[PDB]
Design a protein around this ligand. Structure first.
Ligand SMILES: Cc1ccccc1O
Length: 162
């Protein structure tokens, strides 16, 4: 297991424009196109992202290319963020994957609400952190995925991903 395999499980792979769990147009392996309800705006974002007229459909290789860009940018964003970097760098590599997963899903603005959890994670109070992480809109809206990510934060193992 690694961050790619982990996110592939949590996000799936779809080659045609679909709506994510929040109702937002998306493609590939959780590549958000736009929060706009305009399908045409979504198709334009897709064409911009791929560099060709896709008419709402991409290939597996194209999906994987966006995925690599998205994972990389998520990590680089964490490192640029003064509130996230110290906590991230305090973690072991497996727990860092849980961090990347969380930011990939909810963005840095979503993780902004997790200040208290992040503190407990930095303190390595793993059971307390796990309890605090579940007291969230995140957990209530996507509980089965959040349970896996939280188990990863709690244990520093990949037990939840097989
Ligand atoms: C971005 C991030 C960093 C550390 C812990 C959790 C998390 O979501």
């Amino acid at each position: 297991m690694n961050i790619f395999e982990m996110l592939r499980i949590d996000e799936g792979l779809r080659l045609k424009i679909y709506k994510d769990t929040e109702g937002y147009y998306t493609i590939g392996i959780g590549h958000l196109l736009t929060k706009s309800p305009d399908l045409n705006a979504a198709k334009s974002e897709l064409d911009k992202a791929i560099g060709r007229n896709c008419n709402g459909v991409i290939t597996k290789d194209e999906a994987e290319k966006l995925f690599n860009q998205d994972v990389d940018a998520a990590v680089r964003g964490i490192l640029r963020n003064a509130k996230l970097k110290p906590v991230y760098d305090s973690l072991d590599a497996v727990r860092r994957c849980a961090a990347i997963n969380q930011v990939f899903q909810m963005g840095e603005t979503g993780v902004a609400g997790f200040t208290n959890s992040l503190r407990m994670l930095q303190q390595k109070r793993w059971d307390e952190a796990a309890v605090n992480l579940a007291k969230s809109r995140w957990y209530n809206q996507t509980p089965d995925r959040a349970k896996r990510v939280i188990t990863t934060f709690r244990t520093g193992t990949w037990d939840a991903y097989k």
